[model samples]
Target: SMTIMEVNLLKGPKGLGFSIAGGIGNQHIPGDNSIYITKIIEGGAAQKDGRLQIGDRLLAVNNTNLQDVRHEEAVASLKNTSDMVYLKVAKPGS
Candidate 1:
């Protein structure tokens, strides 16, 4: 069974496919039962997107909610990707 978080979908870059080098942000911080964007990879899709920024709280990756997920679990979730990815972020407790 798959449970999705309720939020607007933020589609990510497609040309990069799934390469870590030109992919997206790099740092993931698990705190207060939520995942936060600690850093954005330079010259990456995330930086190009210009929407994601440091200190942004990650609400969900694709359809999986990261709230209450562990640090390793969040990292693994971010690592799991495809040709296109969707991220939903907001201030914590949104």
Candidate 2:
């Protein structure tokens, strides 16, 4: 499947509830995949939404493209959201 996914993460301004890795500098950080979600905190925003997959590639955050960006900047992009965050992702199909 070649369809993109969009998820609305309704979180608080305090925490977005997840972590990411595997882009540029992250690639050399020992064991880690490339350009995908690294952590999804349980009972968190993503957990409640129940749509995000740690193995999928994050295409963009809040319409700000993350593809081909560096690890540091990717986090930067995610940090720009408010109480609500819009995630655009790409995942595999069976």
Candidate 3:
């Protein structure tokens, strides 16, 4: 099962969510045109499949860009419509 290992919200210099999973790094900074891992649910499709992990950064969802999407929108895109979540996050150099 996939579990939320980390999450950190950036408000200055960039406004996006930085995520990690499967020992992979994904960073999403608005206006930066970069990629970032979105999340790792406890027991979702991605988790059950074992393709993604707790430290993998999300490059894109369905090959669609998630760089400028809102936080709630990002979560919605990954989640199964209804599920409790535990988010573990970290800031760079922390």
Candidate 4:
């Protein structure tokens, strides 16, 4: 059971105004490569959309699955976001 959310961010030239923390730095459970959402910047695109919630584990981006992807690679994939971002996420143990 996973939920897919489509987020179209209108980022300014400065940058895409949203922050996420979670990846290779922390994975308490062995072989659990899922990346969890630690934070969502206030007043940013994520906040405005109000769909992305903290604790939601990111499952995919742009239809590309990230289940077994390395943490560094996952971050890189997220950083490559364009005008629109397609996300598939879910709550742990769901």
Candidate 5:
């Protein structure tokens, strides 16, 4: 089964409080890398929501579609990203 979630998360004192891993794809492997939740840092805002975790894939940051974004670019933008961000997510299960 697959699951999807959305959380309205606002930023903390510093940032999103979590780092990102993967991306849409890389140099040769097209559509390989996907945006995933890499780290759940301390003081994370997602914890308050209790729906987002490291096991899921992050789909969008508002109108910005992450599935087409590059690895570093996603993290770079997420570094200082959003106020009351409604995080879009989905997770595939085996």
Candidate 6:
């Protein structure tokens, strides 16, 4: 289970698709609990932010643990939030 956090707003761009990159290169380690972006929807909060670029791995949700969260629950939590989601993410090649 995961919790919800604050919301932010981003304007200007819309209607597009973005990439989610965060896995180890050439490595398929299981339980890699690290917060991998994994997915992104065009015109969504992350996309609207215009700062949450692809290849960014999520680090935390405000103050919650990312690994303890279910993928669907995480997405739902994000969607239920306001506009902009306060996400702490790690960029690729970190």
The TM-scores, one per candidate, come to 0.63, 0.80, 0.35, 0.72, 0.77, 0.51
Residue-level lDDT of model 2, residues 1-94, one tens digit each, is 6558999887864366777877876672355334688788876888767788777678888878877778888888887778788998878533
Error (Å) of candidate 5 at residue 71 is 0.9
Report the poorest 10 consecutive residues by lDDT, candidate 3: 8-17
lDDT digits (tens) for residues 51-81 of candidate 4:
7788778787776777766678777877887
TM-score of 2: 0.80
Clashing residue pairs in candidate 6 are 8-84
lDDT of 1 by residue, 1-94 (tens): 2222333223354331122111123334322555666666665666666666566666667778776666677667766755466777664343
Off by over 4 Å in 1: 1-31, 92-94
Q: Candidate 6's C-alpha lDDT?
A: 0.48
- Root-mean-square deviation of each candidate, in angstroms? 7.9, 3.4, 12.8, 2.8, 3.1, 7.0
Deviation of model 4 at 66, angstroms: 1.0
Tell me which of candidates 2 and 5 scores higher on TM-score: 2
Residue 10 in candidate 3, Cα distance off native in Å:
31
- Runs in model 6 deviating more than 4 A are 1-29, 39-45
Ranking by TM-score: 2, 5, 4, 1, 6, 3
Q: How well does candidate 3 score on lDDT at residue 1? A: 35
Clashes of each: 0, 0, 17, 0, 1, 1
- Candidate 6, residue 18: lDDT: 37
On TM-score, the candidate that comes out on top is 2
Candidate 3 on 2-41: residue-level lDDT in tens? 3323422222222222343221132244344333455655
TM-score of 1: 0.63
- Give lDDT tens digits, candidate 6, residues 2-94: 332333444224422333332333112364545455556766656655666655555555455454455554445444544344566556562
lDDT of 5: 0.70
Best-fitting candidate, measured by lDDT? 2
Candidate 1 lowest-lDDT run of ten: 15-24
Clashes of 5: 1
Error of 4 at 1 (Å): 3.7
Name the regions of candidate 3 deviating beyond 4 angstroms: 1-39, 79-94
